[PDB]
A paper describes a structure:
Here, we describe a high-affinity minimal antibody, designated [name], obtained via a phage display screening against the C-terminal catalytic domain (ctd) of A3B. [name] also binds APOBEC3A that is highly homologous to A3Bctd but does not bind the catalytic domain of APOBEC3G, another Z1-type deaminase domain. Stable binding poses obtained by the simulation were further tested by site-directed mutagenesis and in vitro binding analyses. These studies mapped the epitope for [name] to a portion of C-terminal α6 helix of A3Bctd, with Arg374 playing an essential role.
To facilitate structural studies of the [name] scFv, we adapted the recently developed “Fv-clasp” strategy, in which the light and heavy chain Fv domains are held together by an antiparallel coiled coil helices (“SARAH” domain for Sav/Rassf/Hpo) with an additional disulfide bond for further stabilization of the heterodimer. The best crystal diffracted to 1.67 Å resolution and the structure was refined to the free R-factor of 23.4%. Unexpectedly, in all cases, the determined crystal structures showed [name]-clasp without the bound antigen, A3Bctd. In the crystals, the antigen-binding cleft between the light and heavy chains of [name]-clasp is occupied by the SARAH domain “clasp” helices, allowing for the formation of an array of [name]-clasp molecules stacked in a head-to-tail fashion to form the crystal lattice. CDR3 of the light chain (QQYYSYPYT) is positioned at the bottom of the recess and does not make direct contacts with the bound α-helices. Notably, the positioning of A3Bctd α6 helix mimics the crystal packing interaction observed in the [name]-clasp crystal structure, where two antiparallel “clasp” helices occupy the antigen-binding cleft of the [name] antibody.
Residue numbers in the entry:
A (entry chain H): 1 to 170
B (entry chain L): 0 to 164
Amino acid sequence: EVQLLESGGDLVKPGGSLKLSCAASGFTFSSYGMSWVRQTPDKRLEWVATISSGGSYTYYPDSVKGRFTISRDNAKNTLYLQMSSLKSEDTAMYYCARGGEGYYFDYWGQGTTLTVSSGSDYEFLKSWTVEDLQKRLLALDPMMEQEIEEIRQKCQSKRQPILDAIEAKH
Amino acid sequence: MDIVMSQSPSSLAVSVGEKVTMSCKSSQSLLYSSNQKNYLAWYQQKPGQSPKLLIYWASTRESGVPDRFTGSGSGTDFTLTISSVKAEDLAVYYCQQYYSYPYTFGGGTKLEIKAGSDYEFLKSWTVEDLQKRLLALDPMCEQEIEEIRQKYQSKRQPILDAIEA
Ligand SMILES: [Cl-]
Ligand code: NA
């Protein structure tokens, strides 16, 4: 069947650059205009770029025009998005989608995430020993584990009454 | 001007079986007179899942979309109606125009179930509806976990860069 699979998301500093890829299969990729759509942390959807089927024409909104470049390889069934001069506001989930060019988006990928870091200056850390830096890292691990465990526990609290109701009906 | 898509209500707490009406206004007509088509789509997105095309040409259902969903309207005023909402319809619904670049989305209408004091109401659901609801939690919870991993990746990176230097 039709499949779109994005890759390339990463953590990047403001002003940096990154290139996303989307592997397309299960349809004649070169026949279709293709697009990128992003979803920001507030869950708003924003169209980012469309490329014509042949690759000759591209379209962008003013928010990314001049910084983003959409491209394609019709023999290799791949769509690309090169993002430059990245800003904090570019942090989002980026979806590959079939459509644009006068059509709705009928197939969407799984998304790949771009995180643009804060841009704060951590120069003072250079004055620290490697031992003190490693201890600061080791202290973040249980903090992440605890926040993950808290989500897992909240999830279970939602699952348990449903699991119980399913079993009660057999 | 760009075309602005405005949706309402922004959120709705619903009971299963209730009729739900969701509205979307465009700032410019989306109807092409020459072919009498409205260049308007609706997408459904559950938490932790990709958006899914639901309705297009304002009133055509995508494959697999059940008939309790009806899209209607023309020109600037559009509506998505669920005649009787099921638990598997609990999702965010986005309208979108594909009439003119830049393509633009509305802000979405979020449908969520009303919170109760106990879960005895689940006995009135079918086993299939209970199973769908249970499994809808899996991508939602995983996407929250991944967001935490991404937050700590960002926290770790200045320290990793200092060590590497
Ligand atoms: Cl309910
Ligand atoms: Na059983």
